[PDB]
Amino acid sequence: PPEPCDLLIEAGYVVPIEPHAVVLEDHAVAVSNGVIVAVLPTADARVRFAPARTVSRPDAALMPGLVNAHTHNPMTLLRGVADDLPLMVWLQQHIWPVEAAVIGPEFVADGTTLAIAEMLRGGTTCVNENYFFADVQAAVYKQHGFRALVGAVIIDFPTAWASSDDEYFARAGELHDQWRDDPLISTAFAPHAPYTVNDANFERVRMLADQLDMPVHLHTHETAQEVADSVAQYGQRPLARLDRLGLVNDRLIAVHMTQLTEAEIHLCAERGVSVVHCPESNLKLASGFCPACALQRASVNLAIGTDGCASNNDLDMFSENRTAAILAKAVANDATALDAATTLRAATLGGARALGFGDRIGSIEVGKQADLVCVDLSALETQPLHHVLSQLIYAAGRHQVTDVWIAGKPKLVQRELIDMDTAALVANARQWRDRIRTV
Amino acid sequence: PPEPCDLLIEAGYVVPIEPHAVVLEDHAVAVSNGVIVAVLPTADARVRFAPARTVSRPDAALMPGLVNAHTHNPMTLLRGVADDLPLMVWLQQHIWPVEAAVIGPEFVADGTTLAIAEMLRGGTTCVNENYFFADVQAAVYKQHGFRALVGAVIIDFPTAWASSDDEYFARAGELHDQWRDDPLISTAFAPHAPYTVNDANFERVRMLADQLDMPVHLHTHETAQEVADSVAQYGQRPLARLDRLGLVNDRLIAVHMTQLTEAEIHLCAERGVSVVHCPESNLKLASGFCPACALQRASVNLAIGTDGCASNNDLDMFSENRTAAILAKAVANDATALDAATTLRAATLGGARALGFGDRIGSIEVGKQADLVCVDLSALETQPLHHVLSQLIYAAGRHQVTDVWIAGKPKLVQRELIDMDTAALVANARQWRDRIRTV
Ligand SMILES: [Mg+2]
Ligand SMILES: [Mg+2]
Ligand SMILES: [Zn+2]
Ligand SMILES: [Zn+2]
Ligand SMILES: [Zn+2]
Ligand SMILES: [Zn+2]
Ligand SMILES: [Zn+2]
Ligand SMILES: [Zn+2]
């Protein structure tokens, strides 16, 4: 007599991530109470289980949700607002003045919600969020059942979010207390950048991150000019200064990291630092060339993120992964750099580990949360199918995602979003388009 | 009383390419006998015309078909066959031996046909094809109503296509004679590479290309090792040798061009040479960094191509354009390089001009052929819509293409392919997958 479980998903291919470079043909995944309870051949699964419901996708690959390890998601409302302009013109004359005019709880809620639809439609199931009004974001992600590490911004300058150091840290503390032990939402400190966060604020982040047990999410070594300005002001590269401040350790999520030495690579490896690679943003802003292959081979935990929609301009992790994989080869002058399996690992388990969720998501293993994605591979764009891992990285587009679950709850069903209305989303986006136009 | 025309396409946005950087809101395009006969505000068009049929796409951008200016389209059957391997292992141990085993008219016809479906579904309407069995390819493109400049391969080594110099040139001559004055298919010489084509064969291409009035389609300066091997063998960089052979002129389509000097840039500008940029292939093979911004600002006609599906691994020109645009900024250390309008220009009119079709395709102007694409912009992935050109380059995915016409004939209608059956295409691709597996 079969054993009950809540859901059985049968697929043409299961890609567990752990073990590495393995593809399980004709396998199924059983789920109960949001948790993965079995991964096994589909014939073996049909004898073993009496699922309350079964989902069969014989043409699809089933893999863990992609983990977008660096977002500013309300900026979906600023999609393409200021393209093809140098960084300081982009920021000073476009991004900051628009943000100043529009940032508040409504803007953050609507932009985050728009991002959640875009992320689900493209098979992303978790984010490492970095934006003002983190309180609203956490609530929005939680309401939609979407997984997130939500950062509390710390910066030396006043904004609508907080006008003083004490206020930024009071908000951070409130965010952490509200979300302690939540299964979907965790919290992090997000000091903005080495050039916008003073030594005293960095010291306070170090102390509170240890006290409250939170990661530290930091834009680091993103540009040549950042490194040079740091030498002028502090006599030291930023990583050297952060090291002396006590911020280079197994809590640090270092984003961008385009300007780097070997010492620094092994520094990151020894201390347990994660690097988030955002290649499309880096290329588009002319920030430089993160040595992703060097970091990966030095055993630095590597994740992949998109950054925001004013410098990408999409949240497409399938694209981001492909860009990471092909750029890594050219930068390293080495065609074996960041192979398909390794890149897919970074996009799932690498991101999971960077956000401190490594034990709960990122691979299809018994006991982990059922954050899962079906990618249709029967589309002619992904045929013939010589190698499934190759196909997911170098040929599949994000529109081939057909089904998405987060903690076993259906979020996208045959390309349809559950409890979201795309028409209302689009109408809301047009309002914001008009408001920004007046600024 | 209204004036008759065959077809009126009404769209939310018309992007004519000529004039540059212009977007016509709420405009229509009238077409008769496959030719564009008017471009004008939709209200003005409804009073003027009595179309036999009208297509209304109020949420869409209408633009010229994308021109993929470098393909090896039968290699769609080799999609992902050998990823993450260095160039000489890729070629010698995988690509050449598989091609040797499978190349023939059936393989070329099936692979080309597969590519035509993928290209149409992604809004590509013209190719610059470079493969064995060009006779079969020309016939296949013509049968599907798909525009192509089809190259006759010239190479010093025997293959199933031709076993001697005389045979390669006899085939080339036959191809040209069969397709003279065809409105859809034109022909070019395709000497393979400087290192596979001897001086005598290059001389023969120069003479026949002038005599028969054909372009010359040549992989040029693709790799460091190509340039160095040339210095060893000929005492000269390859462009210097081709210059002395008389091949650097207004017939040359130079593909890849990753290894380049300034002299060479101005050389190309002075002589009317077109460069085809294939960024994704270049990055994936670690070939290097074509100075696309440098070439464009030096007035070198620049086009964009995908190369083949064993080194991309898709035929996605929306992606290729985005990669070209963002890579150009990082390579040039200049965020204003290859802006959205300029990149879109390269993808349409630049390709048109590279293939010698500049007077017939590449912009929405009266008198040109009605090769047109509707891109749905109402998808949330492309909202809010702050700038249409930005959106087409940095956010739109190829699955947002909804309708495609070539010479005014519908090829893709609401994502449905006309006179193609995707299921048969997929079944055929699986056969080839099995055959290759045995090699
Ligand atoms: Mg992107
Ligand atoms: Mg591609
Ligand atoms: Zn805590
Ligand atoms: Zn950024
Ligand atoms: Zn950022
Ligand atoms: Zn002729
Ligand atoms: Zn190639
Ligand atoms: Zn090629």
Nearest CA in chain B to A59: B426
Beta-strand pair A409-413/B147-154: unpaired
SS3 for B406? strand
Closest Cα of chain A to B322: distance in Å? 9
Q: Is the separation of the CB atoms in B266 and B231 below 8 Å?
A: no
Query: Which residue in A306, A315, A383, A415 has the most chain B C-beta atoms within 10 A of its own C-beta, making it the best mutation to test that interface?
Result: A383
Closest Cα of chain A to B241: distance in Å? 27
Cβ-defined contact of B121 to A381 (cutoff 8 Å): yes
Cα–chain-centroid distance for residue B400?
A: 19
At B257, phi and psi to the nearest 5? Answer: 50, 50
The first and second tokens of residue A40, run together, are: 């096994």
At A200, phi and psi to the nearest 5? Answer: -65, -40
Residues in chain B with CB shorter than 8 Å from the CB of A424 are: none
Q: Taking every pair of C-alpha atoms in chain B, what is the biggest distance, in angstroms? A: 73
Nearest CA in chain A to B284: A326
Residues in chain B with CB shorter than 8 Å from the CB of A334 are: 86, 286
**All residues with CB under 5 Å from ion ligand 6:** B 212-213
Which residue positions of A form the known binding site for Mg(2+)? 280, 312, 314
Which residue positions of B form the known binding site? 70, 72, 176, 212, 219, 222, 280, 307, 312, 314
Give the right CATH number for B65-355 from 3.30.465.10, 3.40.50.150, 3.20.20.140, 3.10.20.30.
3.20.20.140
Q: For helices B105-121 and B422-438, give the axis angle rounded to 10 degrees.
A: 130
Residues in chain A with CB shorter than 8 Å from the CB of B332 are: 286
Residues 403-432 of B with CB under 8 A from A: 422, 425-426, 429-430, 432
Q: Is the separation of the CB atoms in B174 and B138 below 8 Å?
A: no
Burial (CB count within 10 angstroms: exposed 0-12, middle 13-18, buried 19+), residue A411: buried
Q: Is the separation of the CB atoms in B205 and B247 below 8 Å?
A: yes
Q: CA–CA separation, A218 vs A276, rounded Å? A: 10
Q: CA–CA separation, B399 vs A316, rounded Å? A: 13
Per CATH, which fold does B1-64+368-439 belong to? Urease, subunit C; domain 1 (2.30.40)
**All residues with CB under 5 Å from ion ligand 1:** A 280, 312, 314, 316, 319
Is A334 touching B (CB cutoff 8 A)?
Answer: yes
Q: CA–CA separation, B203 vs B246, rounded Å? A: 8
Q: Is the separation of the CB atoms in B425 and B117 below 8 Å?
A: yes
Domain range annotation of chain B: 1-64+368-439, 65-355
Cβ-defined contact of A386 to B282 (cutoff 8 Å): no
Q: Is the separation of the CB atoms in B283 and A331 below 8 Å?
A: no
Query: Which residue in A222, A321, A380 has the most chain B C-beta atoms within 10 A of its own C-beta, making it the best mutation to test that interface?
Result: A380
Q: CA–CA separation, B92 vs B78, rounded Å? A: 15
Elucidated via? X-ray
Cβ-defined contact of B386 to A79 (cutoff 8 Å): yes
Q: Please give, one letter per residue, the 3-state secondary structure of chain A.
A: CCEEEEEEEEEEEECCCCCCCCCEEEEEEEEECCEEEEEEEHHHHHHHEEEEEEEEEEEEEEEECEEEEEECHHHHHHCCCCCCCCHHHHHHHHHHHHHHHHCCHHHHHHHHHHHHHHHHHCCEEEEEEECCCHHHHHHHHHHCCCEEEEEEEECCCCCCCCCCHHHHHHHHHHHHHHHCCCCCEEEEEEECCCCCCCHHHHHHHHHHHHHHCCCEEEEECCCHHHHHHHHHHHCCCHHHHHHHCCCCCCCEEEEECCCCCHHHHHHHHHHCCEEEECHHHHHHCCCCCCCHHHHHHCCCCEEECCCCCCCCCCCCHHHHHHHHHHHHHHHCCCCCCCCHHHHHHHHHHHHHHHCCCCCCCCCCCCCCECCEEEEECCCHHHCCCCCHHHHHHHCCCHHHEEEEEECCEEEEECCEECCCCHHHHHHHHHHHHHHHHHC
Cβ-defined contact of B391 to A336 (cutoff 8 Å): no
Q: CA–CA separation, B265 vs A201, rounded Å? A: 51
SS3 for B70? strand
- Beta-bridge partner residues of B51: B5
- Beta-bridge partner residues of A66: A124
Terminal-residue alpha carbon distance, chain A = 67
Cβ-defined contact of B429 to A86 (cutoff 8 Å): no
Please report, as a single letter, which amino acid is at residue A437.
R
Cβ-defined contact of A395 to B79 (cutoff 8 Å): yes
Is A77 touching B (CB cutoff 8 A)?
Answer: yes
Residues 375-404 of B with CB under 8 A from A: 378, 380-387, 390-391, 394-395, 397-399
Q: For helices B317-331 and A317-331, give the axis angle rounded to 10 degrees.
A: 50
Q: CA–CA separation, A158 vs A406, rounded Å? A: 36
Is A118 touching B (CB cutoff 8 A)?
Answer: yes
From residue B113, give the alpha-carbon distance in Å to each of A391, B99, B107, B345.
20, 17, 10, 27
Closest Cα of chain B to A272: distance in Å? 28
Assign residue B419 a region (left: φ > 0; alpha: ψ between -120 and 50; beta: otherwise): left
Nearest CA in chain B to A433: B384
Q: Please give, one letter per residue, the 3-state secondary structure of B33-58.
A: CCEEEEEEEHHHHHHHEEEEEEEEEE
Q: CA–CA separation, A266 vs A269, rounded Å? A: 5
Which residue positions of B form the known binding site for Zn(2+)? 70, 72, 176, 212, 219, 222, 307
Query: Which residue in B91, B320, B326 has the most chain A C-beta atoms within 10 A of its own C-beta, making it the best mutation to test that interface?
Result: B326
Containing B410, the helix (H) or strand (E) segment is strand B409-413
Place of tokens 């391997």: B85
CA dihedral B246, B249, B250, B251 (to 10 degrees): 40
